[PDB]
Amino acid sequence: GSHSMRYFYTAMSRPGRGEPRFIAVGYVDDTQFVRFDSDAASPRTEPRAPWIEQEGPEYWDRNTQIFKTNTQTYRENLRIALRYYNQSEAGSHIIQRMYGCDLGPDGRLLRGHDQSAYDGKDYIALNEDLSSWTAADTAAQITQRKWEAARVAEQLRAYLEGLCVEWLRRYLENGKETLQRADPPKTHVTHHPVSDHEATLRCWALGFYPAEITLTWQRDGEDQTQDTELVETRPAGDRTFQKWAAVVVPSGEEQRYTCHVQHEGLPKPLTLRW
Amino acid sequence: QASQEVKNW
């Protein structure tokens, strides 16, 4: 239902091993479709999804030229932050940027985002008003003033409310074969036991997309459900996703617990046990 | 499509 388009910018200083490196990656929903790397011999935007390939030369030229200017701009922003935080120029630092538009289920705009970070800590961000910034440090407040004077957010609001939404809708209809596939998950059950009055059991999920999934070990609705060891979804590298949930049950409660499987592709909730 | 807006810190 909700459809997103995000562009991920990564700029990292590497003193002694080369000029800073800018990584630009675009994502629609959870699927990557464009990639830019300054360290590629011919720096240019590479297709990473089937539907984006049909695009003509001018689509690539524009994005490539923008990424190339962004490469040079964020290199100075890295130098700028050194003066703001009073850091050593020989240090290796990373600037990251998340931006894009969230689309409503009716095809109308839901939310717009432009968050920024320095060395993992949030630096600045655009509020849901698409007109004001949220500066974290005292250093970002200096930047906020500059962007407030240069009407930067205004220029960003046109993209987020215009160019972002049009092309997001464009990307969805051309690649709906894959973007709206909603491949549902799988279930496999095992039990790895210590056998000292104890045992471990695991509820699994395989080949699902999107990565949104819920795994819960309610013990026949027992008040306690949090003894379990959950792991993050791990890519199979087959363009498919895998996740397993573990629980250590005292020996003598084989089928008392009730796994809880939930995925968007499967409309009805699935409660499947051994 | 990428934002052409230059943000200078």
Epitope: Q65, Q72, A150, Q155, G162 | Q4, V6
Partner: T-cell receptor, first 112, second 115 residues
Framework: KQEVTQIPAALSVPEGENLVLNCSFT??????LQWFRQDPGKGLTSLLL?????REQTSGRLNASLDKSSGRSTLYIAASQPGDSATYLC???????????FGKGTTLSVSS | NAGVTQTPKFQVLKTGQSMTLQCAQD?????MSWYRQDPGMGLRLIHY???????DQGEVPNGYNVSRSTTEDFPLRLLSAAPSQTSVYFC?????????????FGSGTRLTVVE
């Protein structure tokens, strides 16, 4: 690669007669079209700004149009006055927004 | 007050001399540009600066050098003067690389290089 052509390159219009200045460009995903007037020694004076999304824009005696499909824009000037005589320039914004592609311009000769 | 101020307005150089063309704004414009007009060739881009410390070449950059140490000034140095560099030079500024706003130019500098 990005070429802007202003034909006709010159015009001679009687006083009080409405005239149209034409401009041609190549459609991009997003861009602006801007019209300027160069009077000798005065530099470029901004007149109107139209964008790819918009179709028309009016200010007083000046109307600007934009057709993304035909890659062309028109500048309509009403109640031609003798002081309106200058070189009028049309310009498009490059794809990355780093420059303004300028046409060679069109000279206006309003006859009193 | 506002606008782009270009200094000088007129100047005469001979071949091999050096001179800086000054362009200043206080309109908080992060983008600045340098153009030249020669008859029959239209306005041609020399150099642009999307921001301070950032600078790239344009259509005809040979023989021209620029600097953007500050956001308010974008000078143009003619390291060695040449007869081909006789032209009218225009400086333009704008808030940035977006489509929302437009360029503002200066009065112009008419430069004549003489043998």
């Amino acid at each position: 690669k990005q070429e802007v052509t202003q034909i006709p390159a010159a015009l001679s219009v009687p006083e009080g007669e409405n005239l149209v200045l034409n401009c041609s460009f190549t459609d991009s995903a997003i861009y602006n079209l801007q019209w300027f007037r160069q009077d000798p020694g005065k530099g470029l004076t901004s007149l109107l700004l139209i964008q790819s999304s918009q179709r028309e824009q009016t200010s007083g005696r000046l109307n600007a149009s934009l057709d993304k499909s035909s890659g062309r824009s028109t500048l309509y000037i009403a109640a031609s006055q003798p002081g309106d005589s200058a070189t009028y320039l049309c310009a498009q914004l490059n794809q990355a927004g780093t420059a303004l592609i300028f046409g060679k311009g069109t000279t206006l000769s309003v006859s009193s | 007050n506002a606008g782009v101020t270009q200094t000088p307005k007129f100047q005469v150089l001979k071949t091999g001399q050096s001179m800086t063309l000054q362009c200043a704004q206080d309109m908080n414009h992060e983008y600045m540009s340098w153009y030249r007009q020669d008859p029959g060739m239209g306005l041609r881009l020399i150099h642009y600066s999307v921001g301070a410390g950032i600078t790239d070449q344009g259509e005809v950059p040979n023989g021209y050098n620029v600097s953007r140490s500050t956001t308010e000034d974008f000078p143009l140095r003619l390291l060695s003067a040449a007869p081909s560099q006789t032209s009218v030079y225009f400086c333009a500024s704008s808030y940035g690389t977006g489509i929302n706003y437009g360029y503002t130019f200066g009065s112009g500098t008419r430069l004549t290089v003489v043998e």
